[PDB]
Amino acid sequence: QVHLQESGPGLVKPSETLSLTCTVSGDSMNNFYWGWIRQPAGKGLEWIGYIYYSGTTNYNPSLKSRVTISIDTSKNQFSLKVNSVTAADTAVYYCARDSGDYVSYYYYGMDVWGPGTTVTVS
Template sequence: CTVSGGSVSTGIYYWSWIRQPPGKELEWIGYVSYNGNTNYRPSLKSRVTTSLATSKNQFFLTLTSMTAADTAVYYCARLYCSGGSCHFDQWGQGTLVTVSS
């Protein structure tokens, strides 16, 4: 995911990944912060890696051992935190990933 109009090095943002399986609700996957700290959904933790490419102002999601259950629209998003509260204030357009069994 390429960030425009800001920098992945900004400390108040958490660069996040969210997915929406067909017919289901949005599901948070995880995030990476400006300094490389990460936090992942417990059920996916063993298969997920998020990372930054600061020089290119990009951040990435890697999900291994994918099955049909991972079929979803995947979104990158910016989580903004200030004053003890956080919200997603910018979203990517989403990419449909289909895993055939």
């Protein structure tokens, strides 16, 4: 039932920031981890990081210095900001609900993925 939709800028100049945000509809945000997955065009997937409904954060060590994730339960929306934008940043970004292996036995793995949104760097 629950589905996510990504929103945000499509092209960004170098040395700026990304304001991508996705919404959650049909279910509450509690008891679930929420993260962001990105994929360079034609290459494998990468895990940016996740956030919890409580607000604890975790980031990929390779991008720990450049990325921050914020959440707002009042409107069912979480976003991701990258401090520095380079040509390498161009990729397709996905939003996903992360259900931990042991948190809830009913749900396992990253269940729902939103429609991929492309971000380009000029």
